[PDB]
Design a binder for this molecule. Structure first.
Ligand code: HEM
Length: 439
């Protein structure tokens, strides 16, 4: 049955959503009943509800994706697998996204961001930030996932992913003239492309032309579980498809918005500049940014977090009750759906005083003063974001090189709105800015 799916969809595109939950909390409370995407759903608002859903994976709940997302991502990815297979895939992914592993890719990421800024920003009087950020974010994935530096090949894959992403928000009608149908065709083309990259990679590894750690493709190809089993081609394809979905639209949001919010709060921009320039003062010219420099960008990371609080790229996500669960006096029946949202804590004065104000100081001392399960841009528990530290690296390096290159900037439209009907919140006009390069 339609249930409340239509009203929820209406509120989502309306870019409100907070109200959708607010009025249901006002009428029923934090733990209330609803029907979404044809399933009986219970929304658990607030920190206590967040802990229930997020911290009890495989105990009381399991990740549940809607049918259409399963068809576009595949059934063999880390996001669509459960139980033991999920834990193995996270272990394989940790070989690239883990803190020790991520440090070996900072050089490649730094170089691309540096080259992108110099080529497409440094010499312009004005730029439209959003398309540049999208290009940079995708190209970093192409380099770090597949070692693809060829610009035409990067653009080809970039266009293909855009077509697939259209279907994830269209009506799931697999018919010749619908958006979902074209997305499914795009996924088929991408699968064939990635299959050829897998084959050539297997050869390149056997002939000593590629290493086991150079990129994500090699890490996943060389992974073996505790019993010596490698991942299958379908598992590698679906994981790459899922990782492209997860990485492109999400990271684009804070990167595109960070300098919009900073332009409205110049005192915070002043502190970002001072932090970044102080880091450069202690380096010789030509010396590359290091992982140690990265960890010194504390205030910059506080600005990024406050951007994520006010404009979460992922409003929330769904689980399925794998057992009858007793919560707040009620019993969520097995087979029912559960939903948590950042909108129950992120915009609330109760958890973040003056929530409408941009205050990076909320995350002072590495977030010491943030209450548990109130700031959740990357979720939590066994299903927490695989790539959050990858995103953090991109944002910090991007901010660093921008501040290094430019003395100042000025928004062309200071009153530009920040909407997103599709999940990703972004500058409504792409955030055009005038640029002032350092002399
Ligand atoms: C850029 C690289 C990124 C990669 C490779 C990535 C990858 C992933 C993957 C594979 C998962 C599923 C983990 C699992 O099922 O075990 C996940 C979860 C998640 N991601 Fe990310 N992600 C990235 C960036 C981001 C960003 C920037 C945000 C938001 C600021 C974000 C928000 C989330 C959230 C909230 C979840 C958990 C959803 C839930 O538990 O219901 N991701 N990510």
């Amino acid at each position: 049955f339609i249930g409340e799916s239509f009203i929820f969809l209406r509120a989502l595109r309306s870019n409100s959503l907070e109200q959708f939950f607010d009025e249901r909390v006002k009428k029923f409370g934090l733990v209330f009943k609803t029907s979404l995407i044809g399933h009986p759903t219970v929304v658990l608002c607030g920190p206590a509800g967040n802990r229930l859903i997020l911290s009890n994976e495989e105990k009381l709940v399991q990740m549940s994706w809607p049918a259409q997302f399963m068809k576009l991502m595949g059934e063999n990815s880390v996001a669509t697998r459960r139980g033991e297979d999920h834990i193995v895939m996270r272990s394989a992914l940790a070989g690239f996204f883990g803190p020790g592993a991520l440090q070996s890719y900072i050089g490649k990421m730094n170089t691309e961001i540096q080259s992108h800024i110099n080529e497409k920003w440094k010499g312009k009087d004005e730029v439209n930030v959003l398309p540049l950020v999208r290009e940079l974010v995708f190209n970093i994935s192409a380099i770090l996932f597949f070692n693809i530096y060829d610009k035409q090949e990067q653009d080809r894959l970039h266009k293909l992913l855009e077509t697939i992403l259209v279907g994830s928000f269209a009506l799931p009608i697999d018919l010749p003239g619908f958006g979902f149908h074209r997305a499914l065709q795009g996924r088929a083309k991408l699968n064939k492309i990635m299959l050829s990259l897998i084959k050539k990679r297997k050869e390149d590894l056997q002939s000593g032309s590629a290493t086991a750690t150079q990129d994500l493709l090699s890490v996943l190809l060389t992974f073996r579980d505790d019993k010596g089993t490698p991942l299958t081609n379908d598992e590698i394809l679906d994981n790459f498809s899922s990782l492209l979905h997860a990485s492109y639209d999400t990271t684009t949001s804070p990167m595109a918005l960070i300098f919009k919010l900073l332009s409205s709060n110049p005192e915070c921009y002043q502190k970002v500049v001072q932090e970044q320039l102080e880091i450069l003062s202690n380096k010789e010219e030509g010396e590359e940014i290091t992982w140690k420099d990265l960890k010194a960008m504390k205030y910059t990371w506080q600005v990024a977090q406050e951007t994520l609080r006010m404009f979460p790229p992922v409003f929330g996500t769904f689980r399925k009750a794998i057992t009858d669960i007793q919560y707040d006096g009620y019993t969520i029946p097995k087979g029912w759906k559960l939903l948590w949202t950042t909108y129950s804590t992120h915009p609330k004065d109760l958890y973040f005083n003056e929530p409408e104000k941009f205050m990076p100081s909320r995350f002072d001392q590495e977030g010491k003063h943030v209450a548990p399960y109130t700031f959740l841009p990357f979720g939590g528990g066994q299903r927490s974001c695989v790539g959050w530290e990858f995103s953090k690296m991109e944002i910090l390096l991007f901010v660093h090189h921008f501040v290094k290159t430019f003395s100042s900037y000025t928004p062309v439209d200071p009153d530009e709105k920040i909407s997103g009907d599709p999940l990703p919140p972004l500058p409504s006009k792409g955030f055009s800015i005038k640029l002032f390069p350092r002399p």
